Design a protein around this ligand. Sequence first.
Ligand SMILES: Cc1ccc(CN(C(=O)N[C@@H](CSCc2ccccc2)C(=O)O)C(=O)c2ccc3c(c2)CCN(Cc2ccccc2-c2ccc(Cl)cc2)C3)cc1
Ligand SMILES: Cc1ccc(CN(C(=O)N[C@@H](CSCc2ccccc2)C(=O)O)C(=O)c2ccc3c(c2)CCN(Cc2ccccc2-c2ccc(Cl)cc2)C3)cc1
Lengths: 142, 140
Amino acid sequence: SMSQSNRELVVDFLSYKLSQKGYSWSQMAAVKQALREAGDEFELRYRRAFSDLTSQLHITPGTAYQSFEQVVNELFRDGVNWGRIVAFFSFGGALCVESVDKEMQVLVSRIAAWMATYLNDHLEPWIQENGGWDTFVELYGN
Amino acid sequence: SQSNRELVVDFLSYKLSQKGYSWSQMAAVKQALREAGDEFELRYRRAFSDLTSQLHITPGTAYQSFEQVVNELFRDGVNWGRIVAFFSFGGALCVESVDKEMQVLVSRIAAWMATYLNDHLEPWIQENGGWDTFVELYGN
Ligand SMILES: Cc1ccc(CN(C(=O)N[C@@H](CSCc2ccccc2)C(=O)O)C(=O)c2ccc3c(c2)CCN(Cc2ccccc2-c2ccc(Cl)cc2)C3)cc1
Ligand SMILES: Cc1ccc(CN(C(=O)N[C@@H](CSCc2ccccc2)C(=O)O)C(=O)c2ccc3c(c2)CCN(Cc2ccccc2-c2ccc(Cl)cc2)C3)cc1
């Protein structure tokens, strides 16, 4: 328990320090780091679209899924691409922050579950057809 | 998939941390330690380079170098600042191993760090309120 959590902290810290030098702890660590960076990049470049989105958000536990679904359906209306997948993660992140800001922290675990289901059902088939997350890492790094 | 749930959790942990929030207690510790490591490495830019002048890392001498540095680091006792330096040292030794084309040493360094943490740091950590105390102190 303390043993597993100590190994987890070590792995997390070393994954981070290796990534800062262009190295990686594992394939999964390389995906996680490249997605974190892509999220930061997307949010900064589309800071206006991010600001317009958060301003229009009126989060309540009863309308949270509705808001999630409407944005995600609009986002992927014309199909899937890596850029839109990054925007999907950025949107989930913004909805979680907005939930915590509005003292609705209970929504965070729900949003993560909705994201994971949407990924499994609607994004994973396209991801697998397009070479998987390794292709994303390769394309983003280039 | 398990890996898709893991990516979601990782991304959300990061975005919540950027606003001073956290996904979980464990995510808050990981993020506070990553930041403290970055801060220590910026404040002491030449600390590892001053050590490398004598640490010629090889699979045969890596453990002896790790053990000596870590024993010298904690000679006067444990504190949070030295624990951060311990993680930064491990990180630097892993980078140096990959630079010297001996990435096979990375998983051994990780195992040595985890054993030192379990055996020699965890009693002081637990006596000092656990990793929550570190998060509280670093955030202040
Ligand atoms: C890191 C990064 C990611 C994405 C881009 C932009 N981008 C492209 O550069 N695309 C490429 C094709 S992918 C190439 C690629 C990219 C990354 C890695 C690997 C390969 C192209 O065009 O050549 C897009 O695709 C792209 C994707 C989504 C959106 C835009 C553009 C424009 C703004 N729009 C707002 C929006 C509309 C509807 C519904 C919701 C939201 C919305 C989502 C979240 C919030 Cl928080 C707020 C609002 C979302 C730029 C940088
Ligand atoms: C985020 C942060 C952490 C630590 C500090 C610095 N620092 C202090 O400021 N400490 C405090 C008391 S703890 C306060 C605290 C800190 C963080 C969180 C919470 C509370 C003080 O004194 O006021 C120290 O403790 C401290 C600890 C270790 C060392 C130093 C200073 C100076 C350099 N020295 C080199 C060295 C010597 C022997 C063996 C190995 C190495 C060596 C380790 C790793 C490599 Cl990579 C290379 C070489 C190691 C500064 C910022």
